[PDB]
Amino acid sequence: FSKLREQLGPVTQEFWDNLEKETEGLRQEMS
């Protein structure tokens, strides 16, 4: 279970970071 948790952590973090990068301009457009 520990290996799966270690895999899951950075994957989730990098997904949300990447989503922020690709949506930065659009979120500026709403503001």
């Binding site: 989730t12 949300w16 922020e20 949506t23 979120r27």
Partner: protein
């Protein structure tokens, strides 16, 4: 006639949006806004599928064993509409959009000339500690953070839908008092009258 396939399309879209709303992390402000927007779309889709299935029942003629259920849905949705209105009024009172972004029961607020601070808070306590960290430079309660724009006030106010409780600054803990470098603690005692 009202085709049955729009009910299936609405159910599929509602499932997509509800499942997406279950898994959005609430850490950054844009994620909070995204989660609130997805929840709003979810509620609109839920209203659509409820009303449309009720119309399908009425056009079929089998609505009568479901009148109590649909009336219950409409009553609870009316309550939710009133709750959203109260949330908007809390945003107006706090002079902030944070009551829309956060689901907290209370918001600790104070007014400065350049900023209106509104920090989520869980319950009416007899004291409140605001943590201030320098250079980011921020105010923090319960792990909730607002960017520093100005100093603290001698009086802060905890707002809910129906209550407001005022807190007076009693003590300022510096790094020489606590040992925690680059951090100040402002301690507020609840005003009783």
């Amino acid at each position: 006639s009202l085709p049955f396939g729009w009910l299936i399309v609405g159910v599929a879209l509602l499932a997509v949006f509800q499942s997406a709303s279950k898994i959005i992390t609430l850490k950054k402000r844009w994620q909070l806004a995204l989660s609130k927007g997805v929840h709003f779309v979810c509620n609109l889709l839920l209203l659509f599928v409820t009303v449309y299935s009720h119309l399908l029942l009425v056009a079929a003629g089998l609505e009568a064993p479901f009148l109590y259920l649909y009336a219950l849905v409409y009553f609870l949705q009316s309550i939710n509409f009133v709750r959203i209105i109260m949330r908007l009024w809390l945003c107006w009172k706090c002079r902030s959009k944070n009551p829309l972004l956060y689901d907290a029961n209370y918001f600790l607020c104070w007014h400065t000339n350049c900023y209106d601070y509104c920090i989520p808070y869980n319950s009416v306590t007899s004291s409140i500690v605001i943590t201030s960290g320098d250079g980011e430079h921020d105010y923090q309660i319960g792990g909730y953070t607002e960017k520093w724009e100005s100093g603290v006030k001698d009086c802060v106010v905890l707002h809910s839908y129906f209550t407001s409780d005022y807190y007076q600054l009693y003590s300022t803990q510096l790094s020489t008092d606590t040992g925690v470098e680059h951090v100040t603690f402002f301690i507020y005692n609840k005003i009783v009258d």
